[PDB]
Amino acid sequence: ADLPGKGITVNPVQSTITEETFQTLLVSRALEKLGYTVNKPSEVDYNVGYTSLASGDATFTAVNWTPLHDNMYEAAGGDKKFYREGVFVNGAAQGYLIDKKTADQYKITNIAQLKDPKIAKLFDTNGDGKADLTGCNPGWGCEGAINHQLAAYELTNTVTHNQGNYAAMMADTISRYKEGKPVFYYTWTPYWVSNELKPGKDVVWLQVPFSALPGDKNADTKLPNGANYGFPVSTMHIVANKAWAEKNPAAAKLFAIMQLPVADINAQNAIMHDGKASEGDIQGHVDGWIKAHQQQFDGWVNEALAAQK
């Protein structure tokens, strides 16, 4: 009779990247169908989120990135403190881009070429001679990855990792791009940036000279043909407090089987960027996705409810 989640309050966490709200609320909706009372997501620093999940102050995140959060995940307790099954979002991507105009003009294919100060200066926006890379907010996993790579690739003398508010800085980068000036930035999918700056039209991805990621000395991001963009095909997982998942088998099953296409998050994130980014707007996007994928969503719910619970 009673749904398994009756009377149990769930506390989602995500970052203050509101482009994460859609996927987070999708999990919340499915949890509601299991009977849980789900609070609005807490938007917190990623590491605070991980420590909160480990202590039980939070229930789940839907934005556990591989490889970007590997080091935070392990440092916060790893598999001893967290439940993590399945893959919520497959086929995410990351890397460094420059505008296609400058890439084609100067035959720039690899970030190693920015070791030449004459090339790096093309991307200098503040007059100090160094290329200005639009990069990651303090505390993002991509902060560590970029800093690691700029050192490994002997780029710190010619490249500055510009940090602050990435979203705001990318508005400035796109505005500069539209002036026809050279730009240099890191981005990921899913996010709104790739809708505004498209590889093969506006920008190109740069390769890297060899694999290098923080915390994994044996990382290998090379494609079978020897190409290397610096990052693997990336994923997001649902991560839950381990004890909570053990006490909530229907929710644990749900977390293991949910999957959301990266294209759908990309599309939602673009709609936000285009002007529909309110809490109510995003709730509507979640409800529209469910309607368009109702059999699949219902299947998650029904398999979860059928767990040994």
Curated annotation (Swiss-Prot):
A single MF term (Gene Ontology): transmembrane transporter activity
KW Iron-sulfur (keyword) present: no
Annotated localization: Periplasm
Any one of the GO BP annotations: amino acid transport
Role played: Part of the ProU ABC transporter complex involved in glycine betaine and proline betaine uptake. Binds glycine betaine and proline betaine with high affinity.
NCBIfam families: PRK11119.1 (NF008334)
Name of the protein in question: Glycine betaine/proline betaine-binding periplasmic protein
